[PDB]
Amino acid sequence: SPGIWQLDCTHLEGKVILVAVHVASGYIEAEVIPAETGQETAYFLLKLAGRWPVKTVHTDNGSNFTSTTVKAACWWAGIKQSMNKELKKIIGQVRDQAEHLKTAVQMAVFIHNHKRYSAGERIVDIIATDI
């Protein structure tokens, strides 16, 4: 289904990377956050839901979604309940080219979503067709 996303955090350099994957396309969005908290997860979900038609979200750590703040973001936005290793591979390849990890992360996201169709091309096609 085109509405399914998966969200997980990854750790690197003592920081936290929140990674969202559109399951049908492989498209990724990511953000570096200071620590794993429900508030950061909730805020990310609000941003994601404003950009794409997010219907359901999965995760590999179910406890990620237990906080009152996450539940409120899900409620308001109407959300119901590998590539990560690929992303860390790309991050590692570009890491020395940037001062800050967050820059390297966005470089890796850019590379992933435009590498070849591309993931960025597939998501827009999938969503447009579903409309």
Ligand X SMILES: Cc1nc2ccccc2c(-c2ccc3c4c(ccnc24)CCO3)c1[C@H](OC(C)(C)C)C(=O)O
Minimum gap (Å) between residue 8 Cβ and its own copies:
18
- As a whole number of angstroms, the distance between CA 44 and CA 30 comes to 9
- Establish if 83 lies at the interface with ligand X (CB under 6 A): no
Partner whose footprint covers residue 83, from its own copies, ligand X, none (CB < 5 to 8 Å by kind) = none
Contact map string, positions 9 to 48, toward ligand X, x by CB under 6 A: ------------------------------x--xx--x--
User: Is the Cα dihedral 82, 88, 92, 95 positive or negative?
Assistant: positive
**127 lies in the binding site for its own copies (CB under 8 A):** yes
At a CB cut-off of 8 Å and minimum separation 6, what does 131 contact?
Answer: none
**Contact assessment for residue 80 and residue 56, using Cβ atoms and an 8 Å cutoff:** yes
Query: Which of 23, 24, 43, 55: binder of its own copies (CB under 8 A)?
Result: 43
Ranges within 56-85 binding its own copies (CB under 8 A):
76-77
Which of 111, 123, 1 has the alpha carbon at shortest distance from 56?
Answer: 1
* Chain Cα centroid distance, residue 18: 6
- Residues found near ligand X in the complex (CB under 6 A): 39, 42-43, 46, 68-69, 72-73, 76, 97-100, 103, 107
